[PDB]
Design an enzyme around this catalytic site. Structure first.
Site, PDB file in Angstrom:
ATOM      1  N   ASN A 156       0.837  -1.201   0.000  1.00 44.77           N
ATOM      2  CA  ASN A 156       0.000   0.000   0.000  1.00 44.77           C
ATOM      3  C   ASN A 156       0.867   1.245   0.000  1.00 44.77           C
ATOM      4  O   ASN A 156       1.829   1.315   0.787  1.00 44.77           O
ATOM      5  CB  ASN A 156      -0.886   0.012   1.237  1.00 44.77           C
ATOM      6  CG  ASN A 156      -1.980   1.047   1.145  1.00 44.77           C
ATOM      7  OD1 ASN A 156      -2.519   1.276   0.070  1.00 44.77           O
ATOM      8  ND2 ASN A 156      -2.314   1.668   2.269  1.00 44.77           N
ATOM      9  N   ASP A 170       5.761  -4.774   2.706  1.00 44.98           N
ATOM     10  CA  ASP A 170       4.499  -4.212   3.263  1.00 44.98           C
ATOM     11  C   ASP A 170       3.372  -5.245   3.139  1.00 44.98           C
ATOM     12  O   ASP A 170       3.565  -6.412   3.499  1.00 44.98           O
ATOM     13  CB  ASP A 170       4.238  -2.876   2.585  1.00 44.98           C
ATOM     14  CG  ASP A 170       3.030  -2.142   3.175  1.00 44.98           C
ATOM     15  OD1 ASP A 170       3.154  -1.642   4.327  1.00 44.98           O
ATOM     16  OD2 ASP A 170       1.969  -2.091   2.500  1.00 44.98           O
ATOM     17  N   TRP A 171       2.180  -4.882   2.637  1.00 42.08           N
ATOM     18  CA  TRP A 171       1.114  -5.870   2.542  1.00 42.08           C
ATOM     19  C   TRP A 171       1.432  -6.986   1.558  1.00 42.08           C
ATOM     20  O   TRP A 171       0.894  -8.084   1.706  1.00 42.08           O
ATOM     21  CB  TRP A 171      -0.218  -5.190   2.182  1.00 42.08           C
ATOM     22  CG  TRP A 171      -0.782  -4.574   3.391  1.00 42.08           C
ATOM     23  CD1 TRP A 171      -0.774  -3.253   3.724  1.00 42.08           C
ATOM     24  CD2 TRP A 171      -1.393  -5.264   4.491  1.00 42.08           C
ATOM     25  NE1 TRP A 171      -1.346  -3.072   4.960  1.00 42.08           N
ATOM     26  CE2 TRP A 171      -1.747  -4.289   5.445  1.00 42.08           C
ATOM     27  CE3 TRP A 171      -1.676  -6.606   4.751  1.00 42.08           C
ATOM     28  CZ2 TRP A 171      -2.373  -4.613   6.662  1.00 42.08           C
ATOM     29  CZ3 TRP A 171      -2.300  -6.931   5.949  1.00 42.08           C
ATOM     30  CH2 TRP A 171      -2.646  -5.929   6.893  1.00 42.08           C
ATOM     31  N   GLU A 174      10.792  -4.137   5.245  1.00 45.57           N
ATOM     32  CA  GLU A 174       9.707  -3.310   5.775  1.00 45.57           C
ATOM     33  C   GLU A 174       8.372  -4.045   5.688  1.00 45.57           C
ATOM     34  O   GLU A 174       7.418  -3.621   5.028  1.00 45.57           O
ATOM     35  CB  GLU A 174       9.667  -1.966   5.058  1.00 45.57           C
ATOM     36  CG  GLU A 174      10.704  -1.017   5.641  1.00 45.57           C
ATOM     37  CD  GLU A 174      10.281  -0.493   7.010  1.00 45.57           C
ATOM     38  OE1 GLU A 174      11.129  -0.431   7.928  1.00 45.57           O
ATOM     39  OE2 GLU A 174       9.089  -0.126   7.153  1.00 45.57           O
ATOM     40  N   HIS A 219     -36.085   5.572 -30.152  1.00 44.57           N
ATOM     41  CA  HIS A 219     -34.692   5.765 -30.536  1.00 44.57           C
ATOM     42  C   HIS A 219     -33.894   4.472 -30.647  1.00 44.57           C
ATOM     43  O   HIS A 219     -33.195   4.259 -31.648  1.00 44.57           O
ATOM     44  CB  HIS A 219     -33.988   6.706 -29.563  1.00 44.57           C
ATOM     45  CG  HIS A 219     -32.600   7.055 -29.987  1.00 44.57           C
ATOM     46  ND1 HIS A 219     -32.324   7.686 -31.182  1.00 44.57           N
ATOM     47  CD2 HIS A 219     -31.407   6.856 -29.380  1.00 44.57           C
ATOM     48  CE1 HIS A 219     -31.020   7.879 -31.282  1.00 44.57           C
ATOM     49  NE2 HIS A 219     -30.441   7.390 -30.200  1.00 44.57           N
TER      50      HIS A 219
HETATM   51 CL    CL Z   1      -1.368   0.176   5.216  1.00 47.55          CL
END
Ligand code: CL
Ligand code: CL
Lengths: 292, 290
Positions: free
Chosen positions: A39, A104-105, A128, A270
């Protein structure tokens, strides 16, 4: 000088009814190296790392569902949603054993997949990564109030959705060097204000009525004059009462267009295809061989 | 009247974007090119194509920004549609064609035909765009709405916020009742979008001080697996870091089997943006040993 380009051809694979984008470079064989972002990033985050690895190994770098160039299906986007889509992505690609490179994710996804598939993971490079944070005291002091607000009802959506705080705030706050405008624009791109219904509004504003807009009026008058002079075979379908082509206009066109066949289709406004598709289609089929 | 759409999807990249199209019937011979308008898609042609496909190739694109085509950041003025349809036709390598056209597809088709008159072998058309000399010639039952569509602010509130063109005009402009199945096909390209939901859900899943408990348990579980696994591991870390400060990197060096650690220098969270060359070159040096 850190590269800002993303020189990678797009690849897409259908996964659970949506398409996921992924980078795929390097050789076709050997153990592939699977790069997982978090993210609020995308495979863009790996653009300057992949070229070190591509000479020796296949590099696969997907955009998580709802991110990057991947489709954005209607999900809650809970962690379990990401698990489902990444699981299906790996299987859709027929990957066997992999090396994971995760952040991260993407590291929560990778570690969770590795725990469930330990035979298929030949190595894990990570950084990280998501670990249980025992207290808010272990969260960095300079970002504590902001992440607590992200997790505060109503206020979190105002910051992240309405004010794009994760891309405009957290992302540069969590990089030591300054990001360039080109880099920020790559990170902004998947989350710009959506195009959505713009085409539907622009079309009626282009209709040529009483000379306006003048550019469309001129262009449509030009092809109407072309139609009046052209020997091209023409087939007109009209309904009653019509919208753009009422009965009186059908008769004017019969007087003014060369080489015209006209078919009345019955009641119609139409979208005549929704009122009598079988007559329209059968008459087109019957007319086409006469064009030889 | 059929409500299904039994056509395999085809996509072609046009000016950087994917355009979806129907392509059925024989693979050769003169193709019949079906062009929809507003607010429709190739779905509009679903019950007409099967009459034509037995004898002729049938091609029905979704205009850029519509149907299953991509939605690039454009103004979506007529000139935008002209460019993408021109490039669509050349991308398929079409030479001579028969046009079957309607509404803004007719403005596109006639304009293309006028610019390419040697390549048009016939045109079938219905309810097409012509110069409307006055509002007097727009049928009264729809005139106020179309005047409102062209009025600043009011028009966007109707078409965008209230979906007036799909929920109002489309069924107003068919004599028989459209079914909900048909309405849902027409609504699908324009459903309220996901936008930034993933960005907000992620921080609300972070395992912090026990919460949320389902993520806490899952993350504890893979950390327990990592602590017992012999799999080769490579950790990149920086200072001061965010999730992995130096003291945590040191703890991981003590607790994870088969771990190599690489300090990248100054770093917070997106370490790939601070030292990609060290990260990429160290991964490359590490992979052979696996
Ligand atoms: Cl996050
Ligand atoms: Cl319109």
């Amino acid at each position: 000088e850190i590269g800002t380009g993303f020189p990678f051809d797009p690849h897409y694979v259908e996964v659970l009814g949506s398409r996921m984008h992924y980078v795929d470079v390097g050789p076709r064989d050997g153990t592939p190296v699977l790069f997982l972002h978090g993210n609020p990033t995308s495979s863009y985050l790996w653009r300057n790392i992949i070229p070190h690895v591509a000479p020796s190994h296949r590099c696969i770098a997907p955009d998580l569902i709802g991110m990057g160039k991947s489709d954005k299906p209607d999900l809650d986007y809970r962690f379990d949603d990401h698990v489902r889509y990444l699981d299906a992505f790996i299987e859709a690609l027929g990957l066997e054993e992999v090396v994971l490179v995760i952040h991260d994710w993407g590291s929560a996804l990778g570690f969770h997949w590795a725990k469930r598939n330990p035979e298929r993971v030949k190595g894990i490079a990570f950084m990280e990564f998501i670990r249980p944070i025992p207290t808010w005291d272990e969260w960095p002091e300079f970002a504590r109030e902001l992440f607590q607000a992200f997790r505060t009802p109503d206020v979190g959506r105002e910051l992240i959705i309405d004010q794009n705080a994760f891309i405009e705030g957290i992302l540069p706050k969590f990089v030591v060097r300054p990001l360039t405008e080109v880099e920020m624009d790559h990170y902004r791109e998947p989350f710009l204000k959506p195009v959505w219904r713009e085409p539907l509004w622009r079309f009626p504003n282009e209709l040529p009525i009483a000379g306006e807009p003048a550019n469309i009026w001129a262009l449509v008058e030009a092809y109407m004059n072309w139609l009046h002079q052209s020997p091209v075979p023409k087939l007109l379908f009209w309904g009653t009462p019509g919208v753009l082509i009422p009965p009186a206009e059908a008769a004017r066109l019969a007087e003014s267009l060369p080489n015209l066949k006209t078919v009345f289709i019955g009641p119609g406004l139409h979208y005549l295809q929704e009122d009598n598709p079988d007559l329209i289609g059968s008459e087109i089929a019957r007319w086409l061989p006469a064009l030889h």
